Each structure stands twice: as C-alpha cells, then as structure tokens.
Amino acid sequence: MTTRMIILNGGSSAGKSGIVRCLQSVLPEPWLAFGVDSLIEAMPLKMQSAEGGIEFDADGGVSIGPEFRALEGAWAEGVVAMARAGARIIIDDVFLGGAAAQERWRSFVGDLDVLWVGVRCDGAVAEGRETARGDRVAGMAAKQAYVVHEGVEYDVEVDTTHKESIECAWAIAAHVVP
Amino acid sequence: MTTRMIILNGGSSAGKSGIVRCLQSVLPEPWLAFGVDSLIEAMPLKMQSAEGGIEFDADGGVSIGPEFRALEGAWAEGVVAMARAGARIIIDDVFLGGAAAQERWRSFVGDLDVLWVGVRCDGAVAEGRETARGDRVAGMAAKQAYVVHEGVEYDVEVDTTHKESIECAWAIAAHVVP
Amino acid sequence: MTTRMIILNGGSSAGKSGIVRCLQSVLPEPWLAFGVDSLIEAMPLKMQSAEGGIEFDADGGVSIGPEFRALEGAWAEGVVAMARAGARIIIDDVFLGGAAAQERWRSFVGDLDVLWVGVRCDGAVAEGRETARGDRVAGMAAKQAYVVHEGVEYDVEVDTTHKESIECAWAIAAHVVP
Amino acid sequence: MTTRMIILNGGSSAGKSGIVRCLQSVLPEPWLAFGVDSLIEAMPLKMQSAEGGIEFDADGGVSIGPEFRALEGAWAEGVVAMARAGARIIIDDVFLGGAAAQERWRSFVGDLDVLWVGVRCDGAVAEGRETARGDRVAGMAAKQAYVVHEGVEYDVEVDTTHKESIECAWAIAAHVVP
Ligand SMILES: CC(=O)N[C@H](CO)[C@H](O)c1ccc([N+](=O)[O-])cc1
Ligand SMILES: CC(=O)N[C@H](CO)[C@H](O)c1ccc([N+](=O)[O-])cc1
Ligand SMILES: CC(=O)N[C@H](CO)[C@H](O)c1ccc([N+](=O)[O-])cc1
Ligand SMILES: CC(=O)N[C@H](CO)[C@H](O)c1ccc([N+](=O)[O-])cc1
C-alpha cells in the first residue's frame, strides 16, 4: 500500500525537474530524487562521445546505444534497491521508447509499490520554454512532447501547459500513500 | 529613435531571466544581457559577507549597503558606456527602491534611448515557482513581487502569471525600435 | 579479483572530484561516479535545514544527523547494488567519522571487490585551493584535511599537494583489476 | 600611480579563474571581475552558432568572427568606463591574437593605470587539468598554452605549473598600487 517509488515520465522541458523539487518540499518524509539527467552526470563524459553511448544530434535528437543501456540498467536496479532499503525514491525519466521504456522499468521494479506519473505539456509551449531555459539543444522539447507518452499507462497525469509546478506537485502528492 | 537599451524590472522568480534569453533569441541584432545577478557574480564573494555589501536574510530578505551601491553605480555607468559604444544592452534588474531605483538608472542613462519594461507576476505564483526552482532562498519572491514596481513608470508591462516567457518576449520585442 | 568498486576518501578540496573525472577518462570500461555531494543533491533541499539532516556551520563545520544517515545508508546499499548489477562504481566520499565511516561502508560492501583509495592534501594548500574555488564555505578544507583519514586503511594513497589529478588518477588506475 | 585595472592573460586551464577569485579575497578594496567567459555568457546563445560569431571546433579550436569582435569591443570600452567610474576592475582574458590582442586592449585602456599579468602553465599539465575539470572541450588547453603569450609584454608573470593559485595571487597583489 505505502507508496515506495514515484516515477515521472515526460519530454524535455515539460517541467519535470520543477515538479520534483516541489514534491520534495511538499512531501513530509524525505524523498531522494534521481533521473536520466543525473545518470548522464554520473556517466563518464566520453559516454556522450562513445558509440554505444548517447549522442545529441544537433537537430535536437537523442539516441541511446547498448553501452548506455547496459549501465542504465544496473543503475535502475540500484535505485530500486535503495527503495527496498527503505529510501523513498523519486525518478523523473524520459521514456524515449514509450511503452517499451515503462516495461523495462516494470521488470526492475518488481512488486515494489510504484506511483506512475505522466508529465505532459504542449509541444509548442515546451519548445518555447526550452528557449527561455537556455539549457538544452533547441529541438528536444518538440521531439519528445508526445512520443514518450505513447502507450504508457499512468496512475496520475498532469499537464504543466496551464498548471504551475507546485500545483502539479500537489495533485501528485495526493496520490502518495504514506 | 533606435532602441539602444532595454531595462527589465521585476521581483525574483517573476520570470525575468527566461524573458531575457528569449528576447536574445528573438531580436535579430545581438543583444548583450547583464543584470544584478551577473553583477553579484562579478563582485567579490566577500561582498556578500561585508558590511556595506549585500546580505540575504534567511527570511528571504535582501539589504544593500553603500559599499555595494558604490560598485553598483560605476557598473551602471559601464553598461551605459557599452551601449553608447554601440552594443545593444539588455538589463534585468530588481528595483528594491522602487521609483528611487528607476531614478538612479535615469541619471546614468542620460538621453540614451531606453525601453523601460516591467515584469510582473502574482506573488503566490512566483513563490511557488521559487520552490520549483531551488535556486533562491524561500521568501524573496513574495517579498519583491510588488514593492519593486511601486512608483516605477514603464513603456511596456508583461505579467508572466499566465503568459509564457517566449510570449512576453514577443510583446517586448514589438516595442524595440531598430 | 576484478575490481568492482573504487572508494575515494579525502577532505574537501583535496582534489577528489578532479581525480574522479580523470579516472573516468582513463579507465577503458565506463565507470559511474557517485558521491556524498551527489547525494546531497539527490536529497531534498530541506534536509539541509532539517534537524536530523545536515548543517554547514558558518565556521566551515559540518554535522550529520540521523535523518541524513538514514537516507545515506539506503543510498549506500543502492550503489553497492548497482555494482553487483554489473556497473563499475566510483565513489568519492568524506569519512567525517574516520575509521568509523570506513566500517559503515564495509558492512554495505560485503565481500564485494573494493579498491580503497585515500586522497590526501596539505590542509593549508587545500584551504588555499578552497578559496580559488569559490564553491565551498571557507573552513571545511582545513577542518577535514586530516581527521577524515585518521584510522582509515587504504589500498592506495595519493597526495594531491604536489601531484596533478591526472597523475594521481594514473597511480590509482594502476591498481584497478579488470 | 594607483592601479585601476588588472588584466590577466593565459590559455585555458592555466588557472586564471582561480587566481581571480583569490585576488578578490586577498585585495582589501573590492575588485570586480569580468572576462571573455563572462562575455560569452552575456552574449546571445546564437552568437555561438552564428557566422561572425564564435565557434568551438571539436578538436578544441576556437575562432572569433567580426560579429563577435564588434560586441567584444564595445564591451571592452564598457569595462574601461567602469574603471574610470572608479570601480577596480579585474579582467582575465585569452589573447588568441597574442600581441595583437594586447594592442587592441591598449587602445581601449588609454592612459588608464593597468597592471598587465601573464598566467602561464605547462601545456601538458594544463591539458591534464583540462580533463580533471570536465568543463571545456578537450584540446583548448594545449592549443592556447603558448601562442597566447607570444609577443605580449607583461608587468608580472606567474606560472601555475608548480605554484598554487593563492600563491600566484599573492605575487600579483604585491604589484597592485593602492
Ligand atoms: C541531458 C539532457 O539535456 N537530457 C534531455 C532530457 O533532459 C534529453 O532530451 C534526453 C532524453 C532522453 C534520454 N534517455 O532517456 O536516454 C537522455 C537525454
Ligand atoms: C542572487 C539572488 O538570488 N538575487 C535575487 C534576485 O535574483 C535577490 O532577490 C536580490 C534582489 C535585489 C538585489 N539588488 O537589487 O541589489 C540583489 C539580490
Ligand atoms: C556540499 C559540500 O560542500 N560538501 C563538502 C564536501 O564536498 C562538506 O565538507 C561535507 C563533508 C562531509 C559530508 N558528509 O560526509 O556527510 C557532507 C558535506
Ligand atoms: C567558454 C570557454 O570554454 N572558453 C575558453 C576559454 O575559457 C576558450 O578557449 C576561448 C578562448 C578565447 C576566446 N576569445 O578570446 O574569444 C573565447 C573562448
């Protein structure tokens, strides 16, 4: 019953990061936050220049190779382990493989109580925010805005197009069983 | 006639930074962006621990001392100089002294063509965004949300409460004379 | 035999971070890097303002509470899990509890092949570097420079006082069994 | 007589940034620090993708175009203006044009009291540090390590190859006339 792991899925600039920081402030018990971005951070810089690594096409694309997935997996098993170890875990990801991505997670998650959250946002709005940000390579937002959700089943959906983060956070927190 | 300097004024988390990055992308000619934050950056770290420096009360407050103003001024004269040197300058500030702050600028600006922009945002919304951000000390948003505009005359106002940055940017760009 | 996890221990500004990035570039197989800093990052911002959390005394001190340790532990079990999952893991830590800290790790590590590395540096030199950095609160370097190693047994020691990071990296890489 | 502006010149990873932060802490009067990097920051992101802008060849190269120089100049006149306005200004640059770069500065500086500082460092050592850093594109260090100084006349030289930043700072501070 007790929610042991929250998994957020949404394209870039859909507002995931903000929701996470908000959820952390909201939720009474300490929740650790990890993600694909923090994984990239943990991975050697060359992984971004390697073959089976990950590359960011200048058009805003993103392609993941086996070398990257290999690591990505053991990492997943690791986060799950922290949860089973008793740590509350928040994870914002980007299901490039849509449904496929969610299955991958499911196999690692096992019978662990997980709250599946979908973070949507108008591609155009996202793209616009992508600019105001300056952080990412123009293109990713529009590219992931939809495909990522394609086929994924959530327990809670939030659209940051017209809802503030703190708000989306509140909607999510409301589904977290203590 | 030609707009030589854009000055943005708005409380923390009102969305200034984003607007700036957007304006830069929008406007055809290169615009250099500078601000109170980038000034803090240029100032020695101790300025934040000095007397006549600047201190961030844990309640989200902010107080500026003469040492800080002293520098702040020569800095202002400097940005103005870059403009007169022919560089298009964007400046997002936070008029803690409200009207007083705008006068200070006016004296440095001289007869230089300046577009005064006000960036407003619902204090609560801002405060909420302040959380999603994680960057600033909880409190500043709500504290500056209004006072800063008190008595300031703008050429263009934008409220990021329900308008995206790219949008506010567009509204602003529309007043920039080439 | 095969080295599955590298654990670095050294006071702040002793040069750990740099060594890590270097090791990652050097070592042929991809090594994931995690640490106390990245943990702080994953922890909710309030953990830094909470009771049993972690607080940075203005004199450069640092004290960890049970709430923090609680998380810290499950996190540890998690990193170990990633290793057993097959991911090569690098971990730069700061054994505030000296020997005590190493035992804590040992219990999580189990019979996992681990390379214990000590990163030393002249307190004064460190303190000086602490300034050039601007990142940390003046004081931590000098405070941890020695205590942290007190009682800890390593497999390899490196002193960044007169040795470059890339160099220390090389010395370390040389003890990593493939 | 009174030193009104300190200009540092050295290739990437030669240790400039650190020296600056150190000098700021050392020197009694507040010194504002600006640089080519902070300029890049102030320039629109597209300037990095524009023609007469600036581009970072993947081999670690760097080429500046007229559009970039155009801005770069007015910016220079601006920093000089801040100095004449009474602000003490520190500037760490990278004279890609070697001697040519110093002349450019000289014309803007005028008869302003300036302390010319050269920051040297063994190319290899720099390259190594470039790795430990993770910040820059592998290649720049080795490429600029020497050319930049070629033909430039300094008032003080410091080699961070075997000298800490705080140290180099001290050597520099010693030439600053109050
Ligand atoms: C570091 C960065 O900019 N990452 C963004 C997402 O934040 C990129 O769209 C991305 C998407 C999916 C991904 N993945 O799932 O492997 C890796 C990067
Ligand atoms: C660095 C930081 O967090 N600055 C925020 C604004 O961004 C703070 O509210 C602030 C407001 C006004 C100011 N000032 O005008 O001197 C300095 C800091
Ligand atoms: C975030 C930061 O500045 N951390 C530095 C180390 O990098 C601090 O000395 C520290 C040391 C030990 C620690 N711990 O082990 O819990 C946490 C922070
Ligand atoms: C942003 C960055 O990585 N800049 C480094 C220097 O720090 C690069 O070598 C560089 C050198 C000279 C330069 N310039 O002088 O125009 C611009 C960038």
Question: What tokens does A30 get?
Answer: 């300490």
Residue D10 assigned as binding residue: yes
Residues 64-83 of D with CB under 8 A from B: 67, 70-71, 73-75, 77-83
Q: Which residues have a C–N gap over 2.5 Å right after them in chain D?
A: none
Give, in order, the Cα–Cα distances in Å from D122 to each of A36, B110, C17, D69, D158. Answer: 37, 48, 22, 28, 12
DSSP for C40-107, please give it.
HHHS-GGGGTSSSSEE--TTS--EE-HHHHHHHHHHHHHHHHHHHTT-EEEEEE--TTTHHHHHHHHH
Q: Please tell me which of the candidates C21, C125, C131 has its beta carbon nearest to residue D131.
A: C21
| Residue A105 near residue A34, CB atoms below 8 Å | no
Distance of alpha carbon A131 from alpha carbon A141, whole angstroms = 10
Residue D27 DSSP code: S
Distance of alpha carbon B52 from alpha carbon B43, whole angstroms = 13
Rounded to 10 degrees, the C-alpha dihedral B125/B163/B118/D80 comes to 100
Question: What tokens does D157 get?
Answer: 């030289």
Q: Which of D69, D76, D63, D82 is closest to D106 using CA atoms?
A: D76
Distance of alpha carbon B31 from alpha carbon D43, whole angstroms = 7
Please give the sequence-ordered ranges of beta strands (E in DSSP) within chain B, or none if there are none: 5-9, 31-35, 54-55, 63-64, 88-93, 114-120, 156-159
Q: ∠ CA A127-B123-B56 to the nearest 5 degrees?
A: 100
Question: How far is the first Cα of chain D from the last one, in angstroms, to the nearest whole number?
Answer: 8
Which is it for strands B114-120 and C63-64: parallel, antiparallel or unpaired? Answer: unpaired
Residue B15 assigned as binding residue: yes
Rounded to 10 degrees, the C-alpha dihedral D29/D32/D36/D41 comes to 150
In chain C, what are the domain boundaries?
A: 1-178
* Residue A169 three-state SS: helix
Longest Cα–Cα distance in chain C: 44
Nearest CA in chain D to C133: D18
User: Would you mind telling me the total number of residues written for chain C in this entry?
Assistant: 178
B43 class by beta-carbon count within 10 Å (0-12 exposed, 13-18 middle, 19+ buried): buried
Distance of alpha carbon B36 from alpha carbon B95, whole angstroms = 10
* DSSP H helices in A31-144: 36-42, 66-84, 99-109, 123-133, 140-144
Q: Which residues on chain D are in Cβ contact (under 8 Å) with C17?
A: 132
Longest Cα–Cα distance in chain B: 44
Element (H, E) at D76: helix D66-84
User: Yes or no: is domain D1-178 CATH 3.40.50.300?
Assistant: yes
* Residue A145 three-state SS: coil
Nearest CA in chain D to C122: D164
DSSP for A9-62, please give it.
E--TTSSHHHHHHHHHHHSSS-EEEEEHHHHHHHS-GGGGTSSSSEE--TTS--
Question: What tokens does B21 get?
Answer: 């990055």
- Is B113 annotated in the active site? no
Contacts 24+ apart (CB under 8 A), A23-26: A23/A90, A23/A169, A23/A172, A23/A173, A24/A90, A24/C44, A24/C45, A24/C46, A25/A169, A25/B131, A25/C44, A25/C45, A25/C46, A26/A166, A26/A169, A26/A170, A26/A173
Distance of alpha carbon B91 from alpha carbon B88, whole angstroms = 10
Q: ∠ CA C121-C126-C127 to the nearest 5 degrees?
A: 150
| Residue C168 near residue C10, CB atoms below 8 Å | no
| Residue D84 near residue D91, CB atoms below 8 Å | no
Longest Cα–Cα distance in chain D: 44
Method of determination used here: X-ray
Q: Which residues on chain C are in Cβ contact (under 8 Å) with A78?
A: 78-79, 81-82, 85, 87
Non-local CB neighbours of A173 within 8 Å, separated by 6+ positions? A23, A26, A27
Handedness of CA A141, A147, A152, A154 (dihedral sign): positive
Chains in contact with A, where contact means 3 or more Cβ–Cβ distances below 8 Å, are: B, C
